[PDB]
Amino acid sequence: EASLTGAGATFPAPVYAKWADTYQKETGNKVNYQGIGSSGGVKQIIANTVDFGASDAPLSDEKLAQEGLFQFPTVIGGVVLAVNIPGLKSGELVLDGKTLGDIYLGKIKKWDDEAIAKLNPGLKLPSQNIAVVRRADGSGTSFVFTSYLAKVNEEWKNNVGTGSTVKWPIGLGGKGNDGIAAFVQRLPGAIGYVEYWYAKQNNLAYTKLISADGKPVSPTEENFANAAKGADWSKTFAQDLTNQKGEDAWPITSTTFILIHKDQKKPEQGTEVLKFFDWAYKTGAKQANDLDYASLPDSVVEQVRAAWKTNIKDSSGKPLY
């Protein structure tokens, strides 16, 4: 039995934690996962403080090469807007990209703003102030969210841009996906972006969103999967899954990554990290789906396995998979 340590993205922390627990029950191996945000995860893996780091934001092939790291995707999740609006049921409210961006820009101050009312004809909206919540910590979810906003709101794109950390025009800072979930729960009128699980498991109402094709879609495991249908995984694991074309394609979808060293100084640890994720690929789909994360296609797991064989080695050049 091995004691493994991973750290980073809170976006997939629920599934990593479920997997870790099941893995220990079946094999005794212990995987400790620390949800510190993707930025912290990349920092920790580079400093060799953990066996694997985790980030929703992919590192470029050049950055990976400069750092001697290898990155592989695990699951597909979705970012949703958790809200606390008086009188509204979860999934009742519909927002499109431009209006969502105007909300994050601080231009739309009330829930019954004309722009929101037009996207929701017949929906009774309260004159409640919108309490914008965003991430305090360096975040892969912020990267995905701002990548999306830049595509649908020019003002956002030009003034704030995209990143794991950005100069938020407005909004209170929550620490981690759970921090934003907690804020939304205690703040009437709040809106905050979180990985789907954080909304669902905290019984937070969330909104529908207009797809890239122009249609209202609900955030569901299948709709996150739909957003990745046009992904040419063959080309790279670093797939952009925001605002993708297609029927029922959730617009703020994303995969997430695990970062490990190619040259394993502690080869038993590396070997065990690969076995945990391999077991997850072959055995953990039901657990991932149960937590509303879509599974990576089998072809993609085969690519990961093939890449592990050629990229992960000990100091003597011997493959750890």
Side-chain angles (χ1 to χ4, degrees), residues 22 42 116 208 248 250:
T22 306
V42 174
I116 298 166
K208 281 192 185 175
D248 296 322
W250 181 248

Side-chain angles (χ1 to χ4, degrees), residues 2-3 12 37 39 51 57 100 119 157 246-247 257:
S3 258
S39 296
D51 300 307
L100 179 57
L119 284 164
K157 174 185 170 254
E247 209 77 280
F257 311 84

